[PDB]
Paper text:
The principal constituent of the protein deposits is one of the most abundant proteins in the extracellular matrix (ECM) of the human cornea, transforming growth factor-β–induced protein (TGFBIp). The function of corneal TGFBIp is elusive, but its ability to bind both integrins and ECM molecules indicates a role in cell adhesion. TGFBIp consists of an N-terminal CROPT domain followed by four fasciclin 1 (FAS1) domains (FAS1-1, FAS1-2, FAS1-3, and FAS1-4). The X-ray crystal structure of wildtype TGFBIp reveals an elongated banana-shaped molecule with the five domains arranged like pearls on a curved string.
Lattice corneal dystrophy (LCD) is characterized by the appearance of amyloid plaques. In contrast, the asymmetric unit of the A546T structure contains two molecules, and the unit cell parameters are not related to those of the two other mutants or the unit cell for the wildtype structure. Crystal packing contacts shared by R124H and R555W offer an explanation for their aggregation phenotype, whereas the enhanced susceptibility of A546T toward proteolytic degradation was not immediately explainable from its structure. The low resolution of the data prevents the identification of detailed structural changes induced by the additional methyl and hydroxyl groups of Thr546. Nevertheless, a comparison of FAS1-4 domains from the structures available suggests that the overall location of the α5 helix–containing residues Arg553–Gly560 is altered by the A546T mutation. The significance of this difference is difficult to evaluate as the electron density for the α5 helix is weak compared with other parts of the structure, especially in chain B of the A546T structure. However, an analysis of residue B-factors (i.e., temperature factors) in all available TGFBIp structures suggests that large regions in the FAS1-4 domain, particularly residues 540 to 575, have higher average B-factors than expected in the presence of the A546T mutation. Elevated B-factors in a region of a protein usually correlate with higher mobility or multiple conformations of this region. If the elevated B-factors reflect a higher mobility or conformational heterogeneity of residues 540 to 575 in vivo, this would explain the phenotype and the increased susceptibility to proteolytic degradation. Three cross-links connecting the FAS1-3 and FAS1-4 domains were exclusively identified for A546T. Wildtype and GCD mutants were very resistant to proteolysis by chymotrypsin, whereas chymotrypsin readily degraded P501T, A546D, A546T, and V624M associated with LCD.
Residue numbers in the entry: 46 to 633
Write the structure that this text describes.
């Protein structure tokens, strides 16, 4: 009876006292926990019975400090020889009592100045830790400010979905210990008054001289002086200095990039370091998502141990000092956001082909860069053919792929026009289809694609006549009167059989297809779909109506296209009026 739970990390003395819960973090930062059982606030064990059935009497506020083990706090109250009678006397009070470890965590210079002068500075600090009314934890989760008993100075309270409550970002260790004249709460640090806002702290600290100048240039000083609850991830001078000067000055000389940069360091609520016991997704003011986490007593952002100072308190929120600049994708050039990504092979080939200048400045372009896996068996060599193909992977204007439409045409650097095909579960531009979300830079946008592009060469008949494998097919096309259909404008899907497919027709079938041209016309129209279906547009199963009227069964399995259970030998050969797919048997 009345049995409370303690979740202790292993290695430590870091402990989490709760209102008996069942949701447990298996790991806290990176160290697993064990759970144990003690008696709850206000219950004591009896020997020979299980649980803790006996309640203990209440005592006054001074005496209750010993019960929760805050004995250094108790000793210093008695030292003042003024505050101890009040804690034993009439009234209703709350005290946030620092733990013994907290008092021992004070630097020697701050410990020295209060205990030297007991009446003055020790009494004043202690009053800031108190409130002139009883407050239970039910009124502590609201997040409001409380007025302390030191000069009516505000205390800032924060609450998080995991139940952790903080008092000036100090963790609340032991909650809701009732007293005869109030309640005692044990907290994890010694807290101090909060007199500066975020902007004032920036102007004071010499380590933020570069940051201070950036804030001024954006005109953001109005927001950082005002009321609000924010977290700032504040970059030191050394963080700025780790960035190459040509990159960094480019940002600072661009009003838009500067604003996006700074917004990526600001969060919409105040978040204390003690809040974070697992990976959490947060959204910045710029829009990028960051994964906040921790490894031991080191806070980490996206796996990098770059938080060098936690819990700097302001009147309008919390500041954490950060050792690396968090440059968002929207502040980066096209080269910067892709150089270390999944398309890094392709980026190197643009550089070797002389096209790196297109990616490195401010031109409004869209880059179609295939994935590294396309180039698994080797890179193509840098000829004039490869050079020409690469110019046609750079699209005029900065575009967003979710706003693309079917009848849109995309113009390349040189003079060609590429067609967009939007399907239900994939989006394609000529033969190449988007394989992951866009990365939007400041001036250009990277589309990640699954394949190298193949721009079209002439009509369907231009494709088939240029290859000796379709000599029997071309004569058959001509005999049926279909040649001029496929040399004019259109949106065809041609499953084009080779000579070796014709070489499989039985003798009885081979000469019955030759004579009966009205029958030949009807057979051929069954092989022609009425819209352009590239291989990256099929997904699982699509029916495509033929010109004869009946439907073909098209499917995609293990990256291989099948049509009516016949595999395609060579897909996605582009033509100005359609697409040609090679097949190795004739359909019926």
């Amino acid at each position: 009876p009345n049995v409370c739970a303690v979740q202790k990390v292993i290695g430590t003395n870091r402990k989490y006292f709760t209102n008996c819960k069942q949701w447990y973090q298996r790991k806290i930062c990176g160290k697993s926990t064990v759970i144990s059982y003690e008696c709850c606030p206000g219950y004591e064990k009896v020997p020979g019975e299980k649980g803790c059935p006996a309640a203990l009497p209440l005592s006054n506020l001074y005496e209750t400090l010993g019960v929760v083990g805050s004995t250094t706090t108790q000793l210093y109250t008695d030292r003042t020889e003024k505050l101890r009678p009040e804690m034993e006397g009439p009234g209703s009070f709350t005290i946030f009592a620092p733990s013994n470890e907290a008092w021992a965590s004070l630097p020697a210079e701050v410990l020295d100045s209060l205990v030297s002068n007991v009446n003055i500075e020790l009494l004043n600090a202690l009053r800031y830790h108190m409130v002139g009314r009883r407050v239970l934890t039910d009124e502590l989760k609201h997040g409001m400010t409380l007025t302390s008993m030191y000069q009516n100075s505000n205390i800032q309270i924060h609450h998080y979905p995991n139940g952790i409550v903080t008092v000036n970002c100090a963790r609340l260790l032991k909650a809701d210990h009732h007293a005869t004249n109030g309640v005692v709460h044990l907290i994890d640090k010694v807290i101090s008054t909060i007199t500066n806002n975020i902007q004032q702290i920036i102007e004071i600290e010499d380590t933020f001289e570069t940051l201070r100048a950036a804030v001024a240039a954006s005109g953001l000083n109005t927001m950082l002086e005002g009321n609000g609850q924010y977290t700032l991830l504040a970059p030191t001078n050394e963080a700025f200095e780790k960035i190459p000067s040509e990159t960094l000055n480019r940002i600072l000389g661009d009003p838009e990039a500067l604003r996006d940069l700074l917004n990526n360091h600001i969060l919409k609520s105040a978040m204390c370091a003690e809040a974070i016991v697992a990976g959490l997704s947060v959204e910045t003011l710029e829009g990028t998502t960051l994964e906040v986490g921790c490894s031991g007593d080191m806070l980490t952002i996206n796996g990098k141990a770059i938080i060098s100072n936690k819990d700097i308190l302001a009147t309008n929120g919390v500041i954490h000092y950060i050792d690396e600049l968090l440059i968002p994708d929207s502040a980066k050039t096209l080269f910067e956001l892709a150089a270390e990504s999944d398309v890094s092979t392709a980026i190197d080939l643009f550089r070797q082909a002389g096209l790196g200048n297109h990616l490195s400045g401010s031109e409004r372009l869209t880059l179609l860069a295939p994935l590294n896996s396309v180039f698994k068996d080797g890179t193509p060599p840098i000829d004039a053919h490869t050079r020409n193909l690469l110019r046609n992977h750079i699209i005029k204007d900065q575009l967003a792929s979710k706003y693309l439409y079917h009848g849109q045409t995309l113009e390349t650097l040189g003079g060609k026009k590429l067609r967009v095909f939007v399907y239900r579960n994939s989006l394609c531009i000529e033969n190449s289809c988007i394989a992951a979300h866009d990365k939007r830079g400041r001036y250009g946008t990277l589309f990640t694609m699954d394949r190298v592009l193949t721009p079209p060469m002439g009509t369907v008949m231009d494709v088939l006549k240029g290859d000796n494998r379709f000599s029997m097919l071309v004569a058959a096309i001509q005999s049926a009167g279909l040649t001029e259909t496929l040399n004019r404008e259109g949106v065809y899907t041609v499953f084009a059989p080779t000579n070796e497919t014709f070489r499989a027709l039985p003798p009885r079938e081979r000469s019955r297809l030759l004579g009966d041209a009205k029958e030949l016309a009807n057979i051929l129209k069954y092989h022609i779909g009425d819209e352009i279906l590239v291989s990256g547009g099929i997904g699982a199963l699509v029916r495509l109506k033929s010109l004869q009227g009946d439907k073909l069964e098209v499917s995609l399995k293990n990256n291989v296209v099948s049509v009516n259970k016949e595999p395609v030998a060579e897909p996605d050969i582009m033509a100005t009026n359609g697409v040609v797919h090679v097949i190795t048997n004739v359909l019926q």
